Scaffold this active site. Structure first.
Site, PDB file in Angstrom:
ATOM      1  N   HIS A  59       0.819  -1.223   0.000  1.00 51.82           N
ATOM      2  CA  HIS A  59       0.000   0.000   0.000  1.00 51.82           C
ATOM      3  C   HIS A  59       0.854   1.274   0.000  1.00 51.82           C
ATOM      4  O   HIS A  59       0.345   2.358  -0.273  1.00 51.82           O
ATOM      5  CB  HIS A  59      -1.018   0.022   1.152  1.00 51.82           C
ATOM      6  CG  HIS A  59      -0.453   0.508   2.447  1.00 51.82           C
ATOM      7  ND1 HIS A  59       0.030  -0.349   3.415  1.00 51.82           N
ATOM      8  CD2 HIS A  59      -0.262   1.763   2.925  1.00 51.82           C
ATOM      9  CE1 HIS A  59       0.492   0.358   4.433  1.00 51.82           C
ATOM     10  NE2 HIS A  59       0.327   1.643   4.162  1.00 51.82           N
ATOM     11  N   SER A  64       4.084   3.068   8.012  1.00 47.17           N
ATOM     12  CA  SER A  64       3.693   2.120   6.960  1.00 47.17           C
ATOM     13  C   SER A  64       4.876   1.528   6.241  1.00 47.17           C
ATOM     14  O   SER A  64       5.756   2.263   5.801  1.00 47.17           O
ATOM     15  CB  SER A  64       2.892   2.860   5.889  1.00 47.17           C
ATOM     16  OG  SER A  64       1.762   3.498   6.435  1.00 47.17           O
ATOM     17  N   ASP A 104      -0.270  -7.516   2.047  1.00 47.09           N
ATOM     18  CA  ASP A 104       0.246  -6.156   1.901  1.00 47.09           C
ATOM     19  C   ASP A 104       1.774  -6.180   1.910  1.00 47.09           C
ATOM     20  O   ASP A 104       2.417  -5.897   2.932  1.00 47.09           O
ATOM     21  CB  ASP A 104      -0.304  -5.274   3.031  1.00 47.09           C
ATOM     22  CG  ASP A 104       0.001  -3.799   2.838  1.00 47.09           C
ATOM     23  OD1 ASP A 104       0.450  -3.413   1.739  1.00 47.09           O
ATOM     24  OD2 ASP A 104      -0.225  -3.031   3.790  1.00 47.09           O
TER      25      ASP A 104
HETATM   26  N1  LIG Z   1      -0.863   0.785  13.477  1.00 51.89           N
HETATM   27  C1  LIG Z   1      -1.554   1.730  12.998  1.00 51.89           C
HETATM   28  N2  LIG Z   1      -2.331   2.399  13.750  1.00 51.89           N
HETATM   29  C2  LIG Z   1      -1.440   2.054  11.540  1.00 51.89           C
HETATM   30  C3  LIG Z   1      -0.606   1.298  10.737  1.00 51.89           C
HETATM   31  C4  LIG Z   1      -0.482   1.581   9.385  1.00 51.89           C
HETATM   32  C5  LIG Z   1      -1.193   2.634   8.829  1.00 51.89           C
HETATM   33  C6  LIG Z   1      -1.077   2.949   7.357  1.00 51.89           C
HETATM   34  N3  LIG Z   1      -2.094   2.208   6.628  1.00 51.89           N
HETATM   35  C7  LIG Z   1      -3.199   2.755   6.129  1.00 51.89           C
HETATM   36  O1  LIG Z   1      -3.452   3.946   6.264  1.00 51.89           O
HETATM   37  C8  LIG Z   1      -4.155   1.849   5.410  1.00 51.89           C
HETATM   38  C9  LIG Z   1      -4.044   2.101   3.913  1.00 51.89           C
HETATM   39  C10 LIG Z   1      -5.448   2.342   3.399  1.00 51.89           C
HETATM   40  C11 LIG Z   1      -6.321   2.635   4.608  1.00 51.89           C
HETATM   41  N4  LIG Z   1      -5.547   2.152   5.756  1.00 51.89           N
HETATM   42  C12 LIG Z   1      -5.945   2.008   7.019  1.00 51.89           C
HETATM   43  O2  LIG Z   1      -5.187   1.600   7.894  1.00 51.89           O
HETATM   44  C13 LIG Z   1      -7.371   2.327   7.375  1.00 51.89           C
HETATM   45  C14 LIG Z   1      -8.174   1.036   7.578  1.00 51.89           C
HETATM   46  C15 LIG Z   1      -8.222   0.155   6.344  1.00 51.89           C
HETATM   47  C16 LIG Z   1      -7.542  -1.057   6.347  1.00 51.89           C
HETATM   48  C17 LIG Z   1      -7.572  -1.880   5.228  1.00 51.89           C
HETATM   49  C18 LIG Z   1      -8.289  -1.506   4.095  1.00 51.89           C
HETATM   50  C19 LIG Z   1      -8.974  -0.297   4.093  1.00 51.89           C
HETATM   51  C20 LIG Z   1      -8.943   0.535   5.211  1.00 51.89           C
HETATM   52  N5  LIG Z   1      -7.434   3.081   8.617  1.00 51.89           N
HETATM   53  S1  LIG Z   1      -6.989   4.622   8.737  1.00 51.89           S
HETATM   54  O3  LIG Z   1      -7.497   5.084   9.996  1.00 51.89           O
HETATM   55  O4  LIG Z   1      -7.475   5.338   7.597  1.00 51.89           O
HETATM   56  C21 LIG Z   1      -5.313   4.687   8.804  1.00 51.89           C
HETATM   57  C22 LIG Z   1      -4.784   6.060   9.160  1.00 51.89           C
HETATM   58  C23 LIG Z   1      -4.430   6.333  10.478  1.00 51.89           C
HETATM   59  C24 LIG Z   1      -3.946   7.593  10.820  1.00 51.89           C
HETATM   60  C25 LIG Z   1      -3.807   8.579   9.847  1.00 51.89           C
HETATM   61  C26 LIG Z   1      -4.153   8.303   8.528  1.00 51.89           C
HETATM   62  C27 LIG Z   1      -4.639   7.042   8.182  1.00 51.89           C
HETATM   63  C28 LIG Z   1      -2.027   3.393   9.633  1.00 51.89           C
HETATM   64  C29 LIG Z   1      -2.154   3.109  10.984  1.00 51.89           C
END
Ligand SMILES: N=C(N)c1ccc(CNC(=O)[C@@H]2CCCN2C(=O)[C@@H](Cc2ccccc2)NS(=O)(=O)Cc2ccccc2)cc1
Ligand SMILES: *[C@@H]1O[C@H](CO)[C@@H](O)[C@H](O)[C@H]1NC(C)=O
Ligand code: NA
Ligand code: NA
Lengths: 251, 27
Positions: free
Chosen positions: A43, A198, A99
């Site tokens: 991603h 990430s 991923d």
């Molecule tokens: N450990 C953590 N808290 C963490 C780890 C990695 C990331 C970066 N990744 C990601 O951002 C992945 C990539 C696409 C969306 N996604 C998310 O994590 C989504 C949930 C989701 C999961 C699968 C499919 C669709 C949506 N939550 S989210 O709340 O949007 C993630 C997020 C957190 C803080 C700031 C901005 C974004 C973000 C947060």
């Protein structure tokens, strides 16, 4: 990294920064697995819902770093990308299943005190260490809070969580290619990866041979460091056959 | 062959400040 601390010098010499060329900015973390290969989250490179689709020429890898923003002259090394390989069954449509991505460097990087590869786990090391309660370590230059940015590489140690607890914490469909980690609300500690971490590594130090192994890749989470939520990580061992196939074919 | 052994830690038999936390969790 939320609720972590500053890394020590040389604490994570496999840590890689994926760096956008224009505009110059942090894109993701990653890890060094040999002198020519870097491991990251798919991603980080490809996520169509947010119009993300990077090509080789868009990016650089920066290895040996500690400071987030400063050009670390005589310490860090900067490499160009030869080729990106994304898992062919990476599920960007739904839940980020599988991923994982590899990047081959144009030229080998020289190892140093600050630049050194992490091990990838064998079946036995994975079975021994990937157990609920066992702690791993996550590092990165990502956000210090969900809603700022660190001066230097951050580190946090986090326990692996029981799969049913992982599943019950979210509406997203979890798969065997994922695991989750973090403290429970009841426990007296916290911490999480966040946006910008990430693609970076979740590592464990084997008590059998005293080597560091990369068990996970920072993949996803609902916000960061929320009570009752956990960080999700790509299960590196489960996808190792693909890693091996790519390196054997293109290495 | 040398993977996972850090030049500034394992290679010189120095421990980082929190690696013991990991070891203590490994039953
Ligand atoms: N450990 C953590 N808290 C963490 C780890 C990695 C990331 C970066 N990744 C990601 O951002 C992945 C990539 C696409 C969306 N996604 C998310 O994590 C989504 C949930 C989701 C999961 C699968 C499919 C669709 C949506 N939550 S989210 O709340 O949007 C993630 C997020 C957190 C803080 C700031 C901005 C974004 C973000 C947060
Ligand atoms: C992403 O970029 C590549 C190359 O530019 C392209 O071939 C591909 O179709 C794009 N979209 C996806 C989902 O891979
Ligand atoms: Na659920
Ligand atoms: Na949490």
């Amino acid at each position: 990294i939320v609720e972590g601390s500053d890394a020590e010098i040389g604490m994570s010499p496999w840590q890689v920064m994926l760096f956008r060329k224009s505009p110059q900015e942090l894109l993701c973390g990653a890890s060094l697995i040999s002198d020519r290969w870097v491991l990251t989250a798919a991603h980080c490179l490809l996520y169509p819902p947010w119009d993300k689709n990077f090509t080789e020429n868009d990016l650089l890898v920066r290895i040996g770093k500690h400071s987030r923003t400063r050009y670390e002259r005589n310490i860090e090394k900067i490499s160009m990308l030869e080729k990106i390989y994304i898992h062919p069954r990476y599920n960007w449509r739904e839940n980020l299943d599988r991923d994982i991505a590899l990047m081959k460097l144009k030229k080998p990087v020289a190892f140093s005190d600050y630049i050194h590869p992490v091990c990838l786990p064998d079946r036995e090391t994975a079975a021994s260490l990937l157990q609920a309660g066992y702690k791993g370590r996550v590092t990165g230059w990502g956000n210090l809070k969900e809603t700022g940015q660190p001066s230097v590489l951050q580190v946090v140690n986090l326990p692996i969580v029981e799969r049913p607890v992982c599943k019950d914490s979210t509406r997203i469909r979890i798969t065997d290619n994922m695991f989750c980690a973090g403290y429970k609300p009841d426990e007296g500690k916290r911490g999480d990866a966040c946006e910008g971490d990430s693609g970076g590594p979740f590592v464990m130090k084997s008590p059998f041979n005293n080597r560091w192994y990369q068990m996970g890749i920072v993949s996803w989470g609902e916000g960061c460091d929320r009570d009752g939520k956990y960080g999700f990580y790509t299960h590196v061992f489960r996808l190792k056959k693909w890693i091996q196939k790519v390196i054997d074919q293109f290495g | 062959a040398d993977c996972g052994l850090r030049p500034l830690f394992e290679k010189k038999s120095l421990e980082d400040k929190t690696e013991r936390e990991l070891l203590e969790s490994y039953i």
